[PDB]
């Protein structure tokens, strides 16, 4: 099963931020609340907002921040790229050990979907190669965050900003820089063609071998270039020498050379799965990383 | 469409490690009682005997760093109830409930008292759970959360050879015809949860996917013969009633959606996908969709 991280450490950091008539989610760490800058926009500003102009007109008491039943007091504010940073009275007593990190396409993380400051659900994700997320967003999940948890330390890698016309989601890192070419404005912007994360499918095939399925193996090998020429006809991401290097341990553990697993995938794409399953799926799964598989 | 698990924070604060001799597994600490699988006292065992021979100093409970002192022990069916010196200050509001096949819940998978991940499950019609349990996940619990109140419905006991998992409710009653002993046991043949497929087709309609919709209607009887041929649970009037809110919401009557389903089964997706799948999901309940 694809699993998400236990969400407790993140749940204790979720707050509700309201400015005027707009409300979304915020993240309370130490004495700062982070949230999307869009909170300061009104209906009429969405098309062409001037965030510098809208923020200069605000004072500290324009921002209503609620942690459960407690109103937090804002004592300063500033903007860093597309995230608003609200200084409050009180350091979050439940602040975990944490860091901000920027991730790359193919990486996985968990998302705590929240509504008006209250967590609702948790799910496991990958950053797609077109810099989008195939999320499940309730209407007011703006400001919900994505994370990884390693040894009790939480890495915040994503903050939700908006839904694209195709149903997918776009957002920023916790420094307010968007993933992909998207902007916090209601324009016509659309996601690029999405491709399958090849290195993740191969890692998962190695996971199938480790758990004993070998049905899809064959006796062929391939060159890297030949593999990529085939795979790209199926909208699979090109495989690099870095990806090959990354799969080396798994190859070592299983005794199957990386380009041999590549030949198996070429054939799986040619034939389908003929009513069969691999780990437990009937689809080529691309949201488990090489790092994930070792775990 | 993503399946979502419930936020697990309220359960995370209840997870402890329990050790008896050489055996270590997970426990649930609520108030001054730790709940865990009785097979923690195993070396065809007689659990009546083995536990009379036990005393409090035989159990080592660890809540993270702190060792808890067992001051009493008792058995309820297949779960051991270890009374400890201190109440868990992180005890949520909670209830013990028993679910039925087809209902969904979240599992907090744990390793030696330490939460590792969370995922959303359904109780299969053969009473097993298609889960991913790591080494030492015994004693992990399943739950729903409703209004800040945790409903504990499942405790993990065993991996079946087929890879699926078997467990009890929190009162130690097994789900399915399984026993906590090393007999040879296998899951019975499983079936697809029809009322959940229908709910997921409703969700697909609510999401703008309408290609599978057709002009026809079927009967409950005609459908169940198709269902039976495809290893689908039979559909009942109760199921139909359950789906009424969705039928009302979408203007698609249940037996008209059934017709759509009959056709999907007989003829296939045919290059089309429904919600981003080419197989029909059966681990979303009608309730899950309404929410
Ligand atoms: C949060 C909530 C929202 O409703 C929106 C945004 C955030 O961050 C946002 O950034 C942008 C929009 C709006 O432009 C709709 C988006 C498109 C038309 C692409 C939000 O609505």
Residue numbers in the entry:
A (entry chain A): 4 to 298
B (entry chain B): 3 to 45, 51 to 298
The authors write:
The SARS-CoV-2 Mpro D48N mutant possesses a single amino acid substitution in the residue located near the Mpro active site and has been identified in Alpha, Beta, Gamma, Delta, and Omicron variants as well as recently emerged Omicron XBB subvariants, as documented in the Global Initiative on Sharing All Influenza Data (GISAID).
In order to clarify the mechanism of inhibition of Mpro D48N by shikonin, we obtained the complex crystal structure of Mpro D48N-shikonin at 2.08 Å resolution. Shikonin can be found in the protomer A and inserts well into the active site of Mpro D48N. The naphthoquinone of shikonin forms a π-π interaction with His41 at the Mpro D48N in the S2 subsite, and to accommodate this force His41 undergoes a dramatic conformational change, also has hydrogen bonding with Cys145. Additionally, shikonin forms hydrogen bonds with Arg188, and Gln189 also has hydrogen bonding interactions with His164 in the S1’pocket. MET165 at the S4 site also underwent a conformational change to form a hydrogen bond with shikonin. All these interactions led to a better occupation of the active site of the Mpro D48N by shikonin. Shikonin inhibited SARS-CoV-2 Mpro D48N with an IC50 of 2.49 0μM, comparable to the positive control.
